[PDB]
Design an enzyme around this catalytic site. Structure first.
Site, PDB file in Angstrom:
ATOM      1  N   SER C 100      -2.105  34.853  67.509  1.00 52.73           N
ATOM      2  CA  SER C 100      -0.828  35.581  67.515  1.00 52.73           C
ATOM      3  C   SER C 100       0.163  34.924  66.551  1.00 52.73           C
ATOM      4  O   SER C 100      -0.083  34.929  65.337  1.00 52.73           O
ATOM      5  CB  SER C 100      -0.370  35.665  68.971  1.00 52.73           C
ATOM      6  OG  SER C 100       0.674  36.622  69.090  1.00 52.73           O
ATOM      7  N   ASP C 197      -4.890  46.186  71.433  1.00 51.51           N
ATOM      8  CA  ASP C 197      -3.753  45.268  71.401  1.00 51.51           C
ATOM      9  C   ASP C 197      -2.450  46.060  71.382  1.00 51.51           C
ATOM     10  O   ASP C 197      -2.163  46.781  70.417  1.00 51.51           O
ATOM     11  CB  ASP C 197      -3.868  44.356  70.181  1.00 51.51           C
ATOM     12  CG  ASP C 197      -2.887  43.184  70.210  1.00 51.51           C
ATOM     13  OD1 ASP C 197      -1.775  43.343  70.764  1.00 51.51           O
ATOM     14  OD2 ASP C 197      -3.226  42.109  69.669  1.00 51.51           O
ATOM     15  N   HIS C 227      -4.559  42.001  73.600  1.00 54.61           N
ATOM     16  CA  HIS C 227      -3.855  41.041  72.771  1.00 54.61           C
ATOM     17  C   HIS C 227      -4.345  39.610  72.987  1.00 54.61           C
ATOM     18  O   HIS C 227      -4.430  38.834  72.025  1.00 54.61           O
ATOM     19  CB  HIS C 227      -2.346  41.116  73.024  1.00 54.61           C
ATOM     20  CG  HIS C 227      -1.567  40.184  72.152  1.00 54.61           C
ATOM     21  ND1 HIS C 227      -1.584  40.260  70.774  1.00 54.61           N
ATOM     22  CD2 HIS C 227      -0.768  39.133  72.460  1.00 54.61           C
ATOM     23  CE1 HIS C 227      -0.817  39.307  70.275  1.00 54.61           C
ATOM     24  NE2 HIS C 227      -0.308  38.614  71.276  1.00 54.61           N
TER      25      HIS C 227
END
Ligand SMILES: [Sr+2]
Ligand SMILES: [Sr+2]
Ligand SMILES: [Sr+2]
Ligand SMILES: [Sr+2]
Ligand SMILES: [Sr+2]
Ligand SMILES: [Sr+2]
Ligand SMILES: [Sr+2]
Ligand SMILES: [Sr+2]
Ligand SMILES: [Sr+2]
Ligand SMILES: [Sr+2]
Ligand SMILES: [Sr+2]
Ligand SMILES: [Sr+2]
Lengths: 250, 250, 250
Positions: C100, C197, C227
């Site tokens: 991320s 996601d 995610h």
């Protein structure tokens, strides 16, 4: 050259002596517990002076004229010392000349600064220092050193002023070992070693040469050379090696 | 752009103005005792704004809005200032635009950061500054400056606000001279110079071009250009040089 | 691995856990507000332990065991955190694994340290984070966030523990966006992304792949991945990706 100091924030200030001149410069990286005033360091300075090339010698943290508490020093801190000189004092391309510990640390410096370090010359290169010997010891001795907290060195090391090593220093030094992997040095390397070296076996330089990725590595083995390699003939060999390398790099 | 400050540990904080945009960014490196508010700096900022590229201008230690005691400033400290901006403020590939002293220092920056610096544009590049002129002076004058501790400059320098230079500043600057050796810059370089420059002779840019190892060096000599190169036509030449270089690099 | 701290001058000290071993090492760069104790970080550590390779995980400033005031943290400060680990803790060649936010920051690290970073693996790479979404919002909403001083996030972000973001944080993050320009990463890159996601659209990884200059980029799209990508099968995919990359790099 006269005495200067590199100010570092939250790390001990380093003493160094710097000679102005042409690049590539030379940086001399000393042996274990050695200050910058030894025979080889001074001889390299005088040669650079005669050639008109820039030159730096310096004292590790805790040693000589540098700041620092020697009791807290580690291979990792001394590695960062070399990087501090290379980053904050040296300008432009550099040849590193490393003796014993300094030969271990010059490898780290070339790995970390591949643009700036254009060649390496090692003398009795102590790659992976005494970690190698510690781990070759029988397990019972390894546990005895750990319980005691220090390794009292074989007598042959006493001849050079080495006697005891903390266990914590050995374990920290494990972080900086290189021989378990390829050594990503891509510049020319010259490794001088005395075959009668009782501190670092000459075979260590062959191991380093094999791991270095650079194809341009020569190992020069002197039949009757000892660990310090500071007789008049050994100084001549070192100066000739530097002179030939500068010529080749030009 | 509005005023920001780079915090440095145990070095003076630097004032800078930063414009967001595309990379490659541009960094403007000013002339001796010049702040970031000069005609050329502002013109380059406005051009980057119109192109949508990132841009930084900044003040040297001791100058303008930056911290520091100007009386203790040296070429070496100002060299490190440039590196601090390049390392701690700039992100991604950069074109350096250096005026006078800034052209000397941009060379150091490209040597030190060969990955990040992708081209150089110099204006009246003052490589090796006044060290060159000091060492061309007769020996008796050199000893007079040393005894006095300062060099009172020829009157032609007074027209630009330059009058006196400490001996210690001259001797420190010797560490940062480049013309005695190859200059290991490998990126494209464009060197603008006015032929009527009474501060830095135009021939200095040809000397720099010859020493740069990069084959891609152009020298642009403006017949009636003076040292500041800030007439409307000179600004147009600078902007055209930047625009053509960004196009070539794309 | 046990807890260590990196001392930094005038920046918050960083907590890290380091495993000794062969190079190339791996560094795990965590997601937004994630500490180094998450499922993926621990799984990568265990794999490196089984392979005998060096490994580092660490906590961002303001997070977990690291020092710092989280209220003052920014993408820019966290970018510098990654560089501090890479420069001051890691030695030799490194593979970066970024989740991320960590995938955004690993790109910055590879741009800044092209010699040391030899490959990148991203998981749900959040390049240009929420700046993209902020600037896609209608103008009236953008002015409402600015007047309020914070952006209260859509509810889908609440499922991950994200609720509010200061306006100042969004504007600072604009300095670190990459998708408006070529991304000068030249090493191998592997970008894993779940197609379900809801935080970072999978298309973001294709945008990053297109901008990266390196020809050697693969994007692995998992049809039912979300995610966090931390189910047992997603961990297996990550470990396989690391193992295959180390093999290719050897
Ligand atoms: Sr200090
Ligand atoms: Sr002392
Ligand atoms: Sr053993
Ligand atoms: Sr000869
Ligand atoms: Sr400060
Ligand atoms: Sr002032
Ligand atoms: Sr002369
Ligand atoms: Sr045009
Ligand atoms: Sr601290
Ligand atoms: Sr805390
Ligand atoms: Sr929009
Ligand atoms: Sr396999």
């Amino acid at each position: 050259a006269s005495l200067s100091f590199l100010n570092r924030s939250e790390l001990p200030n380093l003493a160094y002596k710097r000679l102005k001149g042409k690049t590539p410069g030379i940086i001399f990286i000393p042996g274990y517990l050695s200050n910058m005033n030894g025979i080889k360091a001074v001889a390299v300075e005088e040669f650079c002076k005669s050639l008109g090339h820039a030159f730096i010698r310096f004292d590790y943290s805790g040693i000589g004229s540098s700041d620092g508490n020697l009791a807290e020093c580690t291979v990792g801190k001394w590695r960062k010392d070399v990087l501090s000189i290379l980053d904050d004092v040296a300008e432009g391309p550099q040849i590193l000349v490393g003796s014993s510990l300094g030969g271990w640390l010059m490898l780290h410096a070339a790995i970390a600064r591949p643009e700036k370090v254009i060649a390496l010359i090692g003398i009795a290169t102590a790659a992976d220092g005494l970690v190698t010997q510690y781990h070759a010891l029988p397990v019972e001795t390894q546990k005895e050193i750990e319980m005691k907290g220090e390794w009292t060195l074989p007598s042959r090391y006493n001849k050079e002023g080495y006697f005891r090593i903390p266990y914590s220093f050995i374990k920290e030094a494990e972080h900086h070992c290189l021989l378990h992997s390829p050594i990503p040095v891509t510049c020319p390397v010259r490794l001088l070693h005395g075959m009668k070296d009782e501190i670092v076996p000459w075979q260590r330089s062959l191991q380093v040469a094999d791991r270095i990725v650079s194809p341009d590595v020569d190992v020069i083995l002197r039949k009757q050379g000892d660990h310090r390699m500071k007789e008049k003939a050994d100084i001549h060999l070192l100066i000739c090696t530097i002179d030939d390398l500068i010529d080749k790099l030009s």
